[PDB]
């Protein structure tokens, strides 16, 4: 009785890039680590998912000196520098690049997406889809040139920030305590990138952008607010998650909040640490969904770019997440929406 589910926010694609030697083991075998591949996919009722293009800073997110200092909040990590275009781009083609290789590979198991009746078909025939996301923008001049490129190749959704400047605005760096209200706004970059993603139907993704920016995009956007990957600030005051009032926007936008798996964001005590309950999960589930309402809520794991509960562990503990969800209360059409329904009515408005 595992319900198909469709997901907010993954990372397997830096597992490829990481590691381009040994892709088609990592991908059509898994390598025995991390929480993705097509086999545990299949084991664990993972529909589908975006699948985010997200370029690593040199000292990328998962250093030993920043996993470190999240294990024990109170934290603050500094923000890495701009990274340009010129830079970002050939990181960004390399793992756009790996997500159709996924699909020529997979050999019709796995599809990229493009419209919301592909993601719905694939979900009919049980064929596990994927949206080309990006999180951050650096590989889009300010020019906007290439995001007209990588829309006519594919992608669909765009987060302007990752917790890095870039030219169209600034993100949250990670820290706890702390409000997302961390710096400046959108830029006049950053503003014209919200109407042509409006124009181009590219979906916006506020996970990790700052207050001011999240503003700036609820004035601006003419389509519904979404984070993909971001939990209730009211519970756990990550500046990663997201206050009671960005939530009633996003609510009056008719838009979408994937529950993000991370420790960090879903412990009250807001430390990295993977031992913990199913308590703090529903405890945010259930605020998100008081606020933003049943049809406004689903997952957003951040399945290999974050530690998650051991409860979870990986994408085949999403049978057991069901669980504890069933049995706090939720029930069957509920728990559909949560599953996978929500994100496919989120990609029809957008889209
Ligand atoms: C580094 C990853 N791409 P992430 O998805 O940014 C994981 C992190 C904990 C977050 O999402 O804030
Ligand atoms: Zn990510
Ligand atoms: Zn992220």
Sequence with gaps: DTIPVFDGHNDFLLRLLRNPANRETIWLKGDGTGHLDLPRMKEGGFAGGFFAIYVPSPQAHDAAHFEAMMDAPPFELPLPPMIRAEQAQPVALAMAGHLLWMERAARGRFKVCRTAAEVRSCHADGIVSGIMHMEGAEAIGADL??????????????????????????????????????????????????????????????????????????????????????????????????????????????????????????????????????????????????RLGEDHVGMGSDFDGATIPQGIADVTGLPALQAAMRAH???????????????????????
């Design 145 to 290: 040139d290439a995001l007209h490129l990588f829309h006519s190749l594919g992608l669909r959704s765009l987060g302007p920030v990752w917790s890095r400047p870039t030219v169209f605005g600034h993100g949250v760096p990670f820290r706890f305590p702390g409000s997302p209200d961390t710096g400046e706004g959108l830029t006049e970059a950053g503003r014209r990138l919200v109407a042509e993603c409006n124009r181009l139907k590219i979906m916006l993704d506020l996970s990790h952008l700052n207050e001011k920016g999240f503003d700036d995009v609820a004035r601006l956007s003419d389509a519904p607010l979404v984070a993909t990957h971001s939990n209730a600030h009211a519970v756990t005051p990550s500046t990663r998650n997201l206050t009671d009032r960005q939530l009633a926007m996003i609510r009056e936008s008719r838009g979408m909040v994937g529950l993000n798996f991370a420790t960090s964001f879903l412990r009250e005590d807001g430390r990295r640490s993977a031992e913990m309950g199913w308590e703090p999960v529903l405890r945010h589930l259930d605020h998100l969904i008081d």
């Design 329 to 351: 209360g939720y029930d069957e059409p509920l728990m559909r929406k949560l599953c996978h329904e929500n994100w496919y009515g989120l990609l029809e408005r957008t889209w």
